[PDB]
């Protein structure tokens, strides 16, 4: 096995409207308090449940937000969905859907949670990435003691991610959380372990991908 996914837009504009979708293994089983939910967390904040739906379209709603939200599906299309009001940028968050399994009608299970969505809000639109290899001009190490990678810059918003020869050379990795580039953009670093003296007998590749532009690009580290 069981896994969940959610997906939607990578950015929303200031006072526009979000919409999102959620699909899964575990397909529409009518099990032990079985349902699905939507949850969000403010930037670095606590968790917040929004809403959920069960083994028939019995469905339930937050008191404080109510008109701000609405929930349904086309059962045949096998996505759970969520639809919302127009947006104040504070509604930016880590958002997730999740699976429910509450017993005979009590006792909590949210027994699976999806990889989530980077729901992000600004008055501005998307901007695409610039990528740079980082290997230095002068060198002194020997053997597999070294590590190298690529910078990413000038994009907005996140996510961007990196892989090492389509996963095939993944070892001794470091990855750093991205930082706001002070013009109102973002920047990222990720690194992989390498032989200090044997670059070019094999090639080490930054496989960079950026969802908002859907830009995917491969560059040599050496």
């Amino acid at each position: 096995q069981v896994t969940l996914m959610e997906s939607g837009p990578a950015l929303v504009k200031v006072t526009q409207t979000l919409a999102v979708t959620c699909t899964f293994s575990g397909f529409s089983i009518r099990d032990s308090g079985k349902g699905v939910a939507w949850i969000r967390q403010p930037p670095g904040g606590a968790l917040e449940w929004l809403t959920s739906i069960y083994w028939d379209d019995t469905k339930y709603h937050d008191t404080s937000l109510k008109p701000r939200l609405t929930i349904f599906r086309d059962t045949s299309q096998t996505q759970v969905i969520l639809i919302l009001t127009n947006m104040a940028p504070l509604d930016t968050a880590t958002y997730y859907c999740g699976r429910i399994n509450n017993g005979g009608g009590w006792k909590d299970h949210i027994d699976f949670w999806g990889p989530g969505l980077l729901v992000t809000v600004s008055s501005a639109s998307t901007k695409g990435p610039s990528v740079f290899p980082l290997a230095p001009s002068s060198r002194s190490t020997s053997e597999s003691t070294a590590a190298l990678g690529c910078l990413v810059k000038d994009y907005f918003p996140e996510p961007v991610t990196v892989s090492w020869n389509s996963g095939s050379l993944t070892s001794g990795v470091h990855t750093f959380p991205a930082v706001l580039q002070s013009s109102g953009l973002y920047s990222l670093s990720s690194v992989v372990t390498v032989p200090s003296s044997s670059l070019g007998t094999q090639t080490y590749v930054c496989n960079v991908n950026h969802k908002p532009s859907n830009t995917k690009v491969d560059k040599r580290v050496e």
């Binding site: 606590a46 449940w49 997730y96 949210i110 949670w113 740079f132 980082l134």
Partner: protein, 206 residues
């Protein structure tokens, strides 16, 4: 929301006790945790019931209103934020503010550090960036300093607060930025961590 304490700190050998409070009914509170930047993880269910096949050190337990969570043998990796979750009126599912955990007596570890020079596609645009990477340290403390000759940090002070790795060690990065002529006219190209006051330095050269 469900009220709980903000933060908990204890020795690495010690079986820590955590609690959160059910505002109503309470006797079905599940537990979950939040190691940061990532999807959360399931803990105890029903009441006291052990989740199937996840790490066995997290301790099934009960209370009537002060719903309670614990660890058996505490370990360094357990530094994370911990949450209560509840049924409530008509499917009003309720949730806590979190509680952070710190695992004292843990050694710490001195920074692993790396520095990289600016790139040709910056030099074509009169730009330059030095990329400083700070990693493998403990506790989650950092400050950072630079020596682009005698000059202060320029064109992006852009530096992370402390962040956790895959292991219970911590990391950050910094991006001192210049014009290409500032890069060519300077000659010292150096970054220094000052983590817990410890002097740790990297430098680049043509």
């Amino acid at each position: 929301a469900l009220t709980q304490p903000p933060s908990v700190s204890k020795s690495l050998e010690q079986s820590v006790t955590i609690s959160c409070t059910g505002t109503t009914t309470g006797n079905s509170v599940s537990w979950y945790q939040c190691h940061s930047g990532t999807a959360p993880r399931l803990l105890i269910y029903d009441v006291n019931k052990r989740p199937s096949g996840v790490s066995d050190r997290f301790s099934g337990s009960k209370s009537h209103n002060t719903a309670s969570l614990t660890i058996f043998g505490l370990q360094a990796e357990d530094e994370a934020d911990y949450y209560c979750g509840s049924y409530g009126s008509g499917g009003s599912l309720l949730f806590g503010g979190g509680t952070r955990l710190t695992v004292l007596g843990q050694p710490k570890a001195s920074p692993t550090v790396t520095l990289f020079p600016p790139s040709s596609e910056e030099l074509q645009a009169n730009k330059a960036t030095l990329v400083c990477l700070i990693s493998d340290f403990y506790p989650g403390v950092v400050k950072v300093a630079w020596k682009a000759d005698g000059s202060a940090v320029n064109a992006g002070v852009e530096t992370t607060t402390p962040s956790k790795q895959s292991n219970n060690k911590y990391a950050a990065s910094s991006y001192l930025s210049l014009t290409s002529d500032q890069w060519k006219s300077h000659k010292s190209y150096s970054c220094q961590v000052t983590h817990e006051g410890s002097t740790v330095e990297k430098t680049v050269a043509p």
